[PDB]
Design a protein around this nucleic acid. Structure first.
Ligand SMILES: [Mn+2]
Ligand SMILES: [Mn+2]
Ligand SMILES: [Mn+2]
Ligand SMILES: [Mn+2]
Ligand SMILES: [Mn+2]
Ligand SMILES: [Mn+2]
Ligand SMILES: [Mn+2]
Ligand SMILES: [Mn+2]
Ligand code: NA
Ligand code: NA
Length: 326
DNA sequence: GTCGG
DNA sequence: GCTGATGCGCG
DNA sequence: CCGACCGCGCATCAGC
């Protein structure tokens, strides 16, 4: 946290451009500036010193100069006290409310958690669940709870079938002492790249996890990705655990290493790696790494036996999950 | 907003 | 009733 | 200067 003042303001500026300005590339530009400054090993003494980093241009060095001069930023003061901007920003904290719905609510005068209760009937299933667990979803998960969460899913999973393999990923796999949610990568030998039919795989795992009252709600469900809510079992009914976001992702077994690389993250690392893959003639997704043709068409998937195999393809020295929190 | 082309 | 553009989301 | 800026899964609903 050597430059947290600067990275905090860049993050709040990125969030402003996503939620209010609906400018995803200005959101991404600020996050990239913030991620690069988080990585810089000297305390930033001026915007000129920051402009030397890839991702920090004139306008950000200007905001850093103002921020170090005054301890504040005028642009952010305006945004915090703008009724629309701050109300839109607030609503996007509800899961299911993104920048479009937020702006439309505020245009209808719906602009506080109470207002969303009065108009519960204007929310889709996802939003209504995000309002229901609004506070719980902002609570972090101690790694101690994560470990009990991991033990419950792994046990239930192969109480459905021996051959399942469940890998908890996301920030937990990177050794985070606390996590935003639970991200679970799922595989099975009967579902590979050339597999057919099936897809009753995610459902039986989800259904089993519901049958033991671990999953409590569903945000979305498909044959490869599940998004929902879970909860650690209440200790003899004594101040229940917060409800938690869980994501389960079912990847073909022969594609496990691309899948685990993607789901381990972090998101900015994934974006940095895939960009770097692009320069060296590759395209990385959660299934394959494919070579880039002369034109722009992607080639056939390359053989992958390890997370490191992908790093070498793109001439990146392997970085362990702990070192992936970009 | 940024920076490579 | 249908669907594909749009929205929201995952790392 | 100018435009590209990772990659993809699922749900909703305007316009038929
Ligand atoms: Mn009100
Ligand atoms: Mn997560
Ligand atoms: Mn997640
Ligand atoms: Mn029951
Ligand atoms: Mn995330
Ligand atoms: Mn590079
Ligand atoms: Mn459709
Ligand atoms: Mn421009
Ligand atoms: Na720079
Ligand atoms: Na949201």
């Amino acid at each position: 946290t050597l430059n947290g003042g600067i990275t905090d303001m860049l993050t709040e500026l990125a969030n402003f451009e996503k939620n209010v300005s609906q400018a995803i590339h200005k959101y991404n530009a600020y996050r990239k500036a913030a991620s690069v400054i988080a990585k810089y090993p000297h305390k930033i003494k001026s915007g000129a010193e920051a402009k030397k980093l890839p991702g920090v241009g004139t306008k950000i060095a200007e905001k850093i100069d103002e921020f170090l001069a005054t301890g504040k930023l005028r642009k952010l003061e305006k945004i915090r006290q703008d009724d629309t901007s701050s109300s839109i920003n607030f609503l996007t904290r509800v899961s299911g409310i993104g920048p479009s719905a937020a702006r439309k609510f505020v245009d209808e005068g719906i602009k506080t958690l109470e207002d969303l209760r009065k108009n519960e009937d204007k929310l889709n299933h996802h939003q209504r669940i995000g309002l229901k667990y609004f506070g719980d979803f902002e609570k972090r998960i101690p790694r101690e709870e994560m470990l009990q969460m991991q033990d419950i899913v792994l046990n239930e999973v192969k109480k459905v079938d021996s051959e399942y393999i469940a890998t908890v990923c996301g920030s937990f796999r990177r050794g985070a002492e606390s996590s935003g949610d639970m991200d679970v990568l799922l595989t099975h030998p009967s579902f590979t790249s050339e597999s057919t039919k099936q897809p009753k795989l995610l459902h039986q795992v989800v259904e089993q996890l519901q049958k033991v009252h671990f999953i409590t709600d569903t945000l979305s469900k498909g044959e490869t990705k599940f998004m929902g809510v879970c909860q650690l079992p209440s200790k003899n009914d004594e101040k229940e655990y917060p409800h938690r976001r869980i994501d389960i992702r079912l990847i073909p077994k022969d594609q496990y290493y691309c899948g685990v690389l993607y789901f381990t993250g972090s998101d900015i690392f994934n974006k940095n790696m895939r960009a770097h893959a692009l320069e060296k003639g590759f395209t990385i997704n959660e299934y394959t790494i494919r070579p880039l043709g002369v034109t722009g068409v992607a080639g056939e998937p390359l053989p992958v036996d390890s997370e490191k195999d992908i790093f070498d393809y793109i001439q990146w020295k392997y970085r362990e999950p702990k070192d992936r929190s970009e």
